Amino acid sequence: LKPVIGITGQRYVDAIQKVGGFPIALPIDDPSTAVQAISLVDGLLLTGGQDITPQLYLEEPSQEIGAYFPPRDSYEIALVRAALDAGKPIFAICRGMQLVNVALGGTLYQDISQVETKALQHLQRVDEQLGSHTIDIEPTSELAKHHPNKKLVNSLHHQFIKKLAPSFKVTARTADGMIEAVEGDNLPSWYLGVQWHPELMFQTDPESEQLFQALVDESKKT
Amino acid sequence: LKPVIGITGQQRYVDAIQKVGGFPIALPIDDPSTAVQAISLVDGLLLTGGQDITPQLYLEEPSQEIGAYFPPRDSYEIALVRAALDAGKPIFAICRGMQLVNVALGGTLYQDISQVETKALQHLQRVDEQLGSHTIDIEPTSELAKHHPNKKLVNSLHHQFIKKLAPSFKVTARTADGMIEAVEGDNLPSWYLGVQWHPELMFQTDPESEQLFQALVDESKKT
Amino acid sequence: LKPVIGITGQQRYVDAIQKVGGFPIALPIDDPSTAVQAISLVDGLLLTGGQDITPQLYLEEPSQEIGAYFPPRDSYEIALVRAALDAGKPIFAICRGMQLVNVALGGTLYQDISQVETKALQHLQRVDEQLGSHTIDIEPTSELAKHHPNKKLVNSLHHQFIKKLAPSFKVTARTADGMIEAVEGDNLPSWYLGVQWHPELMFQTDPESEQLFQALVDESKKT
Amino acid sequence: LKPVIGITGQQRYVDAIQKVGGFPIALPIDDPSTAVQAISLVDGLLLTGGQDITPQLYLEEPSQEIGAYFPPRDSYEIALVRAALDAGKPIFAICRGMQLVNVALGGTLYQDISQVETKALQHLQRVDEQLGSHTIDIEPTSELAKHHPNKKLVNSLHHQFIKKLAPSFKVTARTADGMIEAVEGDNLPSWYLGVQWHPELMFQTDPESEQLFQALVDESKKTM
Amino acid sequence: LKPVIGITGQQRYVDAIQKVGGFPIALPIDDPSTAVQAISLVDGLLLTGGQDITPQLYLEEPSQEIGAYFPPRDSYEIALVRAALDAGKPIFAICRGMQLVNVALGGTLYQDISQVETKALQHLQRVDEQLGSHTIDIEPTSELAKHHPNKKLVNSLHHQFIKKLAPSFKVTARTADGMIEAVEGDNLPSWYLGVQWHPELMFQTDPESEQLFQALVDESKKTM
Amino acid sequence: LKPVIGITGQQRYVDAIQKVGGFPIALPIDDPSTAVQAISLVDGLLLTGGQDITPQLYLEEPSQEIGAYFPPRDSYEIALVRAALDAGKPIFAICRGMQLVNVALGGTLYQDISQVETKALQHLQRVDEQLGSHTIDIEPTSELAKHHPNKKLVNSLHHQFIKKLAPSFKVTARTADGMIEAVEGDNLPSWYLGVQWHPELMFQTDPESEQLFQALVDESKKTM
Amino acid sequence: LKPVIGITGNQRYVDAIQKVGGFPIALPIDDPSTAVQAISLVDGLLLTGGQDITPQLYLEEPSQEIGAYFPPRDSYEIALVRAALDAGKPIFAICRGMQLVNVALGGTLYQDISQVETKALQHLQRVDEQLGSHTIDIEPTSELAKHHPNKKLVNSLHHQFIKKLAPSFKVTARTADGMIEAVEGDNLPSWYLGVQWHPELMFQTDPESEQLFQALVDESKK
Amino acid sequence: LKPVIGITGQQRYVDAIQKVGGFPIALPIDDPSTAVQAISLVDGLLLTGGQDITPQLYLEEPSQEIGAYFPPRDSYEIALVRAALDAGKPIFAICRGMQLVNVALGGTLYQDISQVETKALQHLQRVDEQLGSHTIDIEPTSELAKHHPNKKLVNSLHHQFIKKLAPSFKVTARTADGMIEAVEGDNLPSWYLGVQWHPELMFQTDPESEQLFQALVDESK
Ligand SMILES: [Mn+2]
Ligand SMILES: [Mn+2]
Ligand SMILES: [Mn+2]
Ligand SMILES: [Mn+2]
Ligand SMILES: [Mn+2]
Ligand SMILES: [Mn+2]
Ligand SMILES: [Mn+2]
Ligand SMILES: [Mn+2]
């Protein structure tokens, strides 16, 4: 049959389904249940959503932070950990890439207004299915295998990765230097973290679809 | 380690299953052919409420008073119901769910309350979703009888009803207007309970309602 | 010190009682068993408007045209009137309140205007809530007649009506369609006036309406 | 008979009091002269959240950052706390409540977050009301300490804060912010606890939060 | 010093009168007693659309399908037509207005289109309010005939209708369902025209409709 | 180069034409007299959905259950089909469009589903617009049959129907309730296909639907 | 009979007049040339609140913080005030009104509260519009001081203020802001009181506010 | 027959063209390669208001304050103007339309009013859109001068402005702001008038604004 992909909590399930995987949605559950959750799947897909609980990366909530739901963050961190434990592949999107970062000691900017240098627009008003800002890609990256340098991708976020967690490296950044893609460095599992929303572009962007195909393939290798 | 309950594509359903000790997994709508793999991933299947069932599935054209439906969901769930019965794994169906099971195995539905021959009671309650609104007579011999006493008060959020009951099923509860509110199997390859109301919206307040979900999970553990 | 008037839980009701010299407190819905204590706190009781009365309370299942209802409120207000009657304290009921007193003592009601045998007039007026809309005939020998003249224009914001009158009560007012607009007591331990309209919305501009609250306070003044 | 708790004028509040064995009644807004009668009806007093407190009451005109406010309410609650203090009955103030008591006794407020000298933390959380959002430091010796451990996460739905603490009170909790989150009385004629957060929205899911209301009721039946 | 037209109550009405050369004034709702003082300020009266007429004014309790109504408004408008009549000043009634005049002189109305014994045509058009929706047959010998040809398309935005026509009036136009669309006067102390439709919404793109307002003004500076 | 398709007026219709190889241009509503100039620059005419056709066009006054209509569009489109017929250019009509053609040539319509003598199936589907809802029987010898199999499920977003079919046309599709879903011409100077449903909302996910627009473009190409 | 008070338009103002004995008349917007005929129909003129005055009328272009304005209303009301002064008829202006009068005679305004050099107080209250929010200081020898005590609480509903007072006028009231809340005529051909607030929303609950309309009526019959 | 005016995309522009004697047709967004066929169908081109032009087209990345943009529309309209010029067909551009032709030929834009050196006047008026709001200074020798008098009140519904003017153009109108409100061509192959305001919303109640449309169809004739 098909490799099972656990999607954390529609365009995400269409993406997996189009690429040959069998998607199941993991509801928010208690952290201790993460191990059972990950045993059910071959790969993990972290979805977009709301800002991450600030206490999780040792910060109290700033006036500019949006809504956040602690139970979700706790559960996903446990999923990330259990997934790394089993060496299963991980594809993270938007907040998802920021969650993996918080999970292993990193930090975030709570709001775009807190970046020292003037940032570009990362909350595009342009149709979400289209790219708004240009990214530079590390040539030797996994990203590099699927997207050409200077590709335009969408953006729907007001938070950014501040301190990058140890054991990762930045593979994509916009012209304002903000981190748009992260990959693993000596990690037990294959990992691609993207700041944009490829599940909104794939229906009209072959290259975006390939990121999902990549996850399913890696899940097949297991 | 908790038994896996597949929840058909909402939150109050995962809460109920977690409260009772099961590990819920939400099954997205997928191609009917993936139903076997889906069921292979779980020990029990919980069918949730939702839109009216595609009438063509019970060989009827859409009447003017039918609501919205989505063929892809119906197709997939019918497939799930079947892969489940084949596996002998337990099934719990709620509202639309009880109606889908009935359609999956050859029964029919009343497309709207105005089509019942008799003027039925209100089944789309305006009362708080968590509170019961209409009393049900229950067959003392049934599985339901083990969890709810006769004349139990349950909620109601629907405008369609089971018309012709599919073979190998017994009606287990009706409201004063004689409308089918609960259905159990008869000689079926797997344990089954279908209620027309929404226990997932009452279990936080009604321990008896919780027993229904607890029953599903206990049966599911049997594998 | 002023008499304490317990208002059943709406700002216009507290305005009316304050303007007439009483000290109002709002009683939240609570368990029936606290009704005794609640009443001990007041000198008079005021039943306000709100949702329809749960049908099972007068032995009927919910019909299709019944609006929303909330069992704990009716259950509590029923316990309240019984504790008020038992203590001989005055009771002034408005709209939903008059209907609740009727059901509390064994009465019945029409679940919707559509269900009345003869075609009724408008009772859910569209005219500004403060203005009277339908004319009522008043019984000359009643409590109502002391403050309201026959053929008085009264407002209306309801869709249910009193069906069968409870024992120990007499109908004091009706609209041209024969529908009950006012109910008074007969051989009961308390001073009772139940009006089907909303005087709290008219008093700030209809001195006659204000007198209905003045009555409740004075009657309560008997302590 | 249960102790009667007068709740100043929502459902969550009555839910909390009932869950703790008290018999609540809501005291609608009335003329200040009736506060005495009002309090003569209860054994305990519970002040609830709501609109900003009228600025003039703490000798200030309205800054263009202030929200709505209804003077008639402030007056009534003021008299209400006075009659409660004089009657020696226990008081529990929530959000707006804690600020009114402060004002009723000479204290002052910040008309808005933007007006605090140093950037404050978020106090009008976007996290659902039932959950705690910011961490608070609690005085180990405080009454609050008896029911809440230090560093407890607490919710926040406010844009004003106490500025100058009315005398005869002591702050018992603050956020990393320095902002005042809890106030207890210093040798007052009655038991008192004012919290800046919303425990009525937390008790259904936070056992410790239920205890604050339990305290009021236990303290209410103590007197009487 | 153009004709002063009093407009009861409406911006399109003021636009209609202003384009026709009159000086419009808006008469607020006042006590019926002030009606004479009101009409003295004007040379012409224009009754506009609005809510349904209070049912008791024509001896009827409110029907289940009757819409909203405002007694004060009806009371004042009736005293307004009587005063306008005494002074022999011209009156132009629109929609609700034509119906009020009727009720003012002892006529009745259907409380709702569903009450008509024969199935009526649509009179509450979903068509652009500026365009005509139903065709009307006009009395070739009527005032209306001098300004509108027969079978012209006119708009419609009403749910009530004239039932029994008050004496001293005549029907000047009807739709194919027999409903009354225009009322003229017989031996009335003043010029009168009441249409059931909304010409103030059509005159901007319908010359014929502008003519009716022109008639009211011509008739007003024909009494000054 | 590409065949030009004049689209009467949304986006999905232009998407359909563009996907199929035609160059679409939207023809705004204009004066009937400009109809021949309009058809002169296009190779094919696509009539889109929209409001009900003004009843006056088929000799009926508006029923209470008729919806909104806009005379100028109907007149212009009428002028368009006539000019298109005179040029022998292909015409594809959708929903309202098929009903406008019927009226233009002398047919009639039921103003509302409630007026059909026999209970009709649902034609204003609640299922999302993109999916079929009712099954249609197709005339095996029809043009439609070259693209759709019998019993094909098609969508429905209408409350009006063809009553009396204009002469020189034949019905080629109906739903189990007998209502007309597709009309074709015979001996007409132009290729013509009229469907009651909305193929533009299904073509993105229903190849057969796309064929309908393909046929229009293929045919408009044969005339060059 | 009863004094005919002309009320300028785009209901509480009507209520105020009627209760005080005047007979209100609504003056729709018309051409400036008709102001003479309009005033000739009344004994008193009441200028009501509304939109900001078009900036050009006081020789300024629209700034980004200015709200909506409708030139026809303004032009007509300016002609209205001129015809009133000519006929010596009394004038009572409210909110926008007091501002129009000041513009019609050469004065200027602050296009927005943000453009004031001194941080002003709140003049667009969130409080029940029927209640007063900010305390005003009243001039002892004021026509206003004859109806309102000093330090009275009054309401607000504006974001624009009078900048430069116009000739023949004296500032009668001010909030601790310094902002002007009332202006009176000085050597003017007619009685004039202009209040920045909305007494028409308080009069039903503040007897003193009722006096202001009483003054206009009395002064009008004379 | 009448001169055909292709309208890019809006009912008021159609009304404008019809009121003035032209036969309008709406050109929906299509692929750039189809622009030449589009212009071959028309006698004149009318560029309409709409969303901000995408940043990259004038070699810039999106600032936090740009509004929404739709690359396909910009791509097609640019191909459209290029085709119109090759054919020498007249062009009348309105609002974003003026900015699109500017970027089309090398120009630049201010992504938002807050990015201008000085505090600009209000250019997103709250006044009824049919009325003028800010007075513009017009060049006495302007083609624009032939229809509008200097110090003319004109409407405004935009938050972006022309920054660097493209070559072969000249500014013909400015608000007391210094902000460019009208542009005309300098030795361009076709007749051209670019306006920052929305005359199609004023012509109903402003004879001069109608003249701008009449001027387009007369050139297209
Ligand atoms: Mn981004
Ligand atoms: Mn039911
Ligand atoms: Mn009634
Ligand atoms: Mn806080
Ligand atoms: Mn009509
Ligand atoms: Mn159909
Ligand atoms: Mn002010
Ligand atoms: Mn501008």
PDB file of N, CA, C and O in Angstrom, chain G residues 83-111:
ATOM      1  N   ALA G  83     -27.147  84.482   6.411  1.00  0.00           N
ATOM      2  CA  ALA G  83     -28.507  84.996   6.315  1.00  0.00           C
ATOM      3  C   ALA G  83     -29.086  85.182   7.709  1.00  0.00           C
ATOM      4  O   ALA G  83     -29.900  86.068   7.937  1.00  0.00           O
ATOM      5  N   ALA G  84     -28.659  84.346   8.647  1.00  0.00           N
ATOM      6  CA  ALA G  84     -29.149  84.433  10.015  1.00  0.00           C
ATOM      7  C   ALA G  84     -28.639  85.710  10.693  1.00  0.00           C
ATOM      8  O   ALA G  84     -29.404  86.435  11.339  1.00  0.00           O
ATOM      9  N   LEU G  85     -27.345  85.976  10.549  1.00  0.00           N
ATOM     10  CA  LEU G  85     -26.752  87.166  11.136  1.00  0.00           C
ATOM     11  C   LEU G  85     -27.405  88.408  10.536  1.00  0.00           C
ATOM     12  O   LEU G  85     -27.673  89.377  11.247  1.00  0.00           O
ATOM     13  N   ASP G  86     -27.665  88.368   9.230  1.00  0.00           N
ATOM     14  CA  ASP G  86     -28.314  89.479   8.526  1.00  0.00           C
ATOM     15  C   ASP G  86     -29.654  89.801   9.173  1.00  0.00           C
ATOM     16  O   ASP G  86     -29.920  90.945   9.536  1.00  0.00           O
ATOM     17  N   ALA G  87     -30.489  88.776   9.310  1.00  0.00           N
ATOM     18  CA  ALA G  87     -31.809  88.924   9.901  1.00  0.00           C
ATOM     19  C   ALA G  87     -31.752  88.995  11.423  1.00  0.00           C
ATOM     20  O   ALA G  87     -32.787  88.973  12.088  1.00  0.00           O
ATOM     21  N   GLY G  88     -30.544  89.077  11.970  1.00  0.00           N
ATOM     22  CA  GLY G  88     -30.389  89.141  13.414  1.00  0.00           C
ATOM     23  C   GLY G  88     -30.929  87.942  14.183  1.00  0.00           C
ATOM     24  O   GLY G  88     -30.883  87.924  15.416  1.00  0.00           O
ATOM     25  N   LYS G  89     -31.433  86.940  13.466  1.00  0.00           N
ATOM     26  CA  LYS G  89     -31.995  85.740  14.092  1.00  0.00           C
ATOM     27  C   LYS G  89     -30.954  85.043  14.966  1.00  0.00           C
ATOM     28  O   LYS G  89     -29.769  85.035  14.645  1.00  0.00           O
ATOM     29  N   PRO G  90     -31.387  84.444  16.084  1.00  0.00           N
ATOM     30  CA  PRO G  90     -30.499  83.740  17.018  1.00  0.00           C
ATOM     31  C   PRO G  90     -29.876  82.471  16.427  1.00  0.00           C
ATOM     32  O   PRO G  90     -30.459  81.824  15.556  1.00  0.00           O
ATOM     33  N   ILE G  91     -28.692  82.119  16.922  1.00  0.00           N
ATOM     34  CA  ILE G  91     -27.981  80.935  16.452  1.00  0.00           C
ATOM     35  C   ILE G  91     -27.422  80.109  17.612  1.00  0.00           C
ATOM     36  O   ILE G  91     -26.780  80.641  18.516  1.00  0.00           O
ATOM     37  N   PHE G  92     -27.682  78.806  17.577  1.00  0.00           N
ATOM     38  CA  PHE G  92     -27.184  77.886  18.595  1.00  0.00           C
ATOM     39  C   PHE G  92     -26.506  76.754  17.837  1.00  0.00           C
ATOM     40  O   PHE G  92     -27.167  75.995  17.137  1.00  0.00           O
ATOM     41  N   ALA G  93     -25.187  76.662  17.963  1.00  0.00           N
ATOM     42  CA  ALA G  93     -24.418  75.635  17.271  1.00  0.00           C
ATOM     43  C   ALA G  93     -23.933  74.537  18.216  1.00  0.00           C
ATOM     44  O   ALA G  93     -23.642  74.782  19.389  1.00  0.00           O
ATOM     45  N   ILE G  94     -23.847  73.322  17.681  1.00  0.00           N
ATOM     46  CA  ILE G  94     -23.422  72.161  18.448  1.00  0.00           C
ATOM     47  C   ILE G  94     -22.364  71.353  17.677  1.00  0.00           C
ATOM     48  O   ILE G  94     -22.493  71.149  16.469  1.00  0.00           O
ATOM     49  N   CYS G  95     -21.316  70.919  18.384  1.00  0.00           N
ATOM     50  CA  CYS G  95     -20.219  70.131  17.805  1.00  0.00           C
ATOM     51  C   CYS G  95     -19.746  70.711  16.474  1.00  0.00           C
ATOM     52  O   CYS G  95     -19.125  71.770  16.415  1.00  0.00           O
ATOM     53  N   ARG G  96     -20.033  69.985  15.404  1.00  0.00           N
ATOM     54  CA  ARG G  96     -19.680  70.406  14.062  1.00  0.00           C
ATOM     55  C   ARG G  96     -20.136  71.851  13.853  1.00  0.00           C
ATOM     56  O   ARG G  96     -19.414  72.671  13.284  1.00  0.00           O
ATOM     57  N   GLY G  97     -21.345  72.146  14.323  1.00  0.00           N
ATOM     58  CA  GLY G  97     -21.913  73.475  14.176  1.00  0.00           C
ATOM     59  C   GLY G  97     -21.015  74.608  14.625  1.00  0.00           C
ATOM     60  O   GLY G  97     -20.778  75.563  13.882  1.00  0.00           O
ATOM     61  N   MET G  98     -20.524  74.506  15.850  1.00  0.00           N
ATOM     62  CA  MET G  98     -19.648  75.523  16.394  1.00  0.00           C
ATOM     63  C   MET G  98     -18.430  75.665  15.494  1.00  0.00           C
ATOM     64  O   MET G  98     -17.866  76.753  15.362  1.00  0.00           O
ATOM     65  N   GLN G  99     -18.033  74.564  14.864  1.00  0.00           N
ATOM     66  CA  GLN G  99     -16.879  74.592  13.986  1.00  0.00           C
ATOM     67  C   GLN G  99     -17.191  75.236  12.652  1.00  0.00           C
ATOM     68  O   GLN G  99     -16.351  75.943  12.088  1.00  0.00           O
ATOM     69  N   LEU G 100     -18.399  75.007  12.147  1.00  0.00           N
ATOM     70  CA  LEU G 100     -18.783  75.604  10.879  1.00  0.00           C
ATOM     71  C   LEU G 100     -18.820  77.127  11.022  1.00  0.00           C
ATOM     72  O   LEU G 100     -18.246  77.853  10.217  1.00  0.00           O
ATOM     73  N   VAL G 101     -19.514  77.598  12.053  1.00  0.00           N
ATOM     74  CA  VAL G 101     -19.616  79.026  12.319  1.00  0.00           C
ATOM     75  C   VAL G 101     -18.230  79.664  12.321  1.00  0.00           C
ATOM     76  O   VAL G 101     -18.029  80.709  11.713  1.00  0.00           O
ATOM     77  N   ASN G 102     -17.276  79.026  12.994  1.00  0.00           N
ATOM     78  CA  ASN G 102     -15.912  79.551  13.063  1.00  0.00           C
ATOM     79  C   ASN G 102     -15.213  79.562  11.709  1.00  0.00           C
ATOM     80  O   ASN G 102     -14.368  80.419  11.449  1.00  0.00           O
ATOM     81  N   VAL G 103     -15.552  78.614  10.846  1.00  0.00           N
ATOM     82  CA  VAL G 103     -14.930  78.569   9.528  1.00  0.00           C
ATOM     83  C   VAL G 103     -15.572  79.596   8.613  1.00  0.00           C
ATOM     84  O   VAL G 103     -14.888  80.274   7.847  1.00  0.00           O
ATOM     85  N   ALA G 104     -16.892  79.711   8.704  1.00  0.00           N
ATOM     86  CA  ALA G 104     -17.647  80.641   7.874  1.00  0.00           C
ATOM     87  C   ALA G 104     -17.208  82.094   8.038  1.00  0.00           C
ATOM     88  O   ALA G 104     -17.400  82.909   7.135  1.00  0.00           O
ATOM     89  N   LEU G 105     -16.614  82.415   9.183  1.00  0.00           N
ATOM     90  CA  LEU G 105     -16.173  83.778   9.446  1.00  0.00           C
ATOM     91  C   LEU G 105     -14.660  83.998   9.529  1.00  0.00           C
ATOM     92  O   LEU G 105     -14.198  84.909  10.219  1.00  0.00           O
ATOM     93  N   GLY G 106     -13.892  83.160   8.834  1.00  0.00           N
ATOM     94  CA  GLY G 106     -12.448  83.322   8.815  1.00  0.00           C
ATOM     95  C   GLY G 106     -11.573  82.487   9.732  1.00  0.00           C
ATOM     96  O   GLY G 106     -10.350  82.561   9.632  1.00  0.00           O
ATOM     97  N   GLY G 107     -12.166  81.699  10.621  1.00  0.00           N
ATOM     98  CA  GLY G 107     -11.362  80.881  11.514  1.00  0.00           C
ATOM     99  C   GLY G 107     -10.809  79.617  10.866  1.00  0.00           C
ATOM    100  O   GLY G 107     -11.074  79.329   9.697  1.00  0.00           O
ATOM    101  N   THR G 108     -10.034  78.859  11.632  1.00  0.00           N
ATOM    102  CA  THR G 108      -9.450  77.624  11.147  1.00  0.00           C
ATOM    103  C   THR G 108      -9.658  76.505  12.170  1.00  0.00           C
ATOM    104  O   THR G 108     -10.072  76.750  13.303  1.00  0.00           O
ATOM    105  N   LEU G 109      -9.365  75.273  11.770  1.00  0.00           N
ATOM    106  CA  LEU G 109      -9.551  74.134  12.663  1.00  0.00           C
ATOM    107  C   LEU G 109      -8.369  73.191  12.633  1.00  0.00           C
ATOM    108  O   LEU G 109      -7.525  73.259  11.741  1.00  0.00           O
ATOM    109  N   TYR G 110      -8.314  72.318  13.631  1.00  0.00           N
ATOM    110  CA  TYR G 110      -7.294  71.279  13.674  1.00  0.00           C
ATOM    111  C   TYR G 110      -7.972  70.110  12.965  1.00  0.00           C
ATOM    112  O   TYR G 110      -9.053  69.677  13.373  1.00  0.00           O
ATOM    113  N   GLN G 111      -7.349  69.611  11.905  1.00  0.00           N
ATOM    114  CA  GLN G 111      -7.925  68.511  11.156  1.00  0.00           C
ATOM    115  C   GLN G 111      -8.048  67.211  11.956  1.00  0.00           C
ATOM    116  O   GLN G 111      -8.840  66.335  11.604  1.00  0.00           O
TER     117      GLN G 111
END
